[PDB]
Design a protein around this ligand. Sequence first.
Ligand SMILES: Nc1ncnc2[nH]cnc12
Ligand SMILES: Nc1ncnc2[nH]cnc12
Lengths: 223, 231
Amino acid sequence: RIAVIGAMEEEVRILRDKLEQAETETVAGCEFTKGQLAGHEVILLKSGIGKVNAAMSTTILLERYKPEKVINTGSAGGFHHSLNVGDVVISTEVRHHDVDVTAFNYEYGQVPGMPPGFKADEALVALAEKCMQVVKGMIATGDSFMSDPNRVAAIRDKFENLYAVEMEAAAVAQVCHQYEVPFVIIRALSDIAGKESNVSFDQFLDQAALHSTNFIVKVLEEL
Amino acid sequence: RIAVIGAMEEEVRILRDKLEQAETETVAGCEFTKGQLAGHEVILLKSGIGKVNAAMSTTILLERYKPEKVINTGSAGGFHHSLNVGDVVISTEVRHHDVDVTAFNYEYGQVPGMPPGFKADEALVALAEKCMQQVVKGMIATGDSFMSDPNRVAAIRDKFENLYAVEMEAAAVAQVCHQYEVPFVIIRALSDIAGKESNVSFDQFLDQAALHSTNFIVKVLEELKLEHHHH
Ligand SMILES: Nc1ncnc2[nH]cnc12
Ligand SMILES: Nc1ncnc2[nH]cnc12
């Protein structure tokens, strides 16, 4: 009934240990752990990294498990100047930052036949809000780790006030969009995109998993 | 039994009219037409444009229909300097051109946990080779962008060994098939030359690209007739 999707082992292991009556099964190399948490039937999925992994894995989830709602968790790169490593971000909206079909007058980041961005579920956002350092804002995804400052600068000028950046959210949202399943992204910051990113990431990935997981647990507890 | 995937309507409509006993069904806004062609059970899928669309749609195909082999068709942007609009390219290998996790020492284009590229099926490539008698065989790389910007094109040139064509689905298809362990091959035709007058050329020669790609695929399909050769 409720799905939580994380890319890496560190981002899911915390939740997986809290699950009870855990029954794990692998499909196309993707781990699906199914159990009980906060009186919910929770389908935990390790999606792997990147758009295609997330899209494939999210599709398998929606085909086989049919969850009513979907939450995407894990680390992300800080983009807005107010935010620090450790901070949690709830998705208001999700976009691709590396999509460019502007040669056919789709606005930057817009996949053809898709809306320019994917709005997260109002009910889930409202709920997350009550449990709110946690912030609410736009998350954009690309198939790259944003460690290059130039790449980060190139993205700044394309969106209104991007909060965080990562590599799965938009794939998750876009799939959910077409299946018409409510979604929300809840991730924590492992680093600041473009600033010593990968050294910071290795240092604070476990922290990001922890903060993200704990907020999700309280949202579940509250849902 | 055999799946053929294409992103736009122009890239599938040609095939879809050749199908017999056609029975179409929509899943998550994706068209799946199922019928008979060249004595094969052919699942025709309009995937939509882009990596996520292709990945989702390919996954639905593999979950629901369980095809033994997968072919990806449609238009593509010419990258190698010998090739012209109209030319057909068979995938030797497929890569992402817009993937960069080199901060963790994956080579450029390599998605983490994936091989640097996805080799197409040897049997399918060998078969396609025979039917080449302009058709060529080479690497195809995918990104979530239409490569009309010359700068974007130049940036890619220096990353791969001798890229032939670029588009927006092949690597998603291959990566899914990779993990499902389903043989695949990309067979696309050139609508334009990436970075040149790409979108004006594309609108002009998309139908031609669909046609050439579809016809080659039909004769590759027809070339079985090789599981028997009797008839
Ligand atoms: N955690 C993260 N995920 C994706 N891209 C990033 N760039 C910097 N940090 C990142
Ligand atoms: N047909 C095509 N597909 C994707 N990218 C391109 N760039 C130029 N032509 C293209």
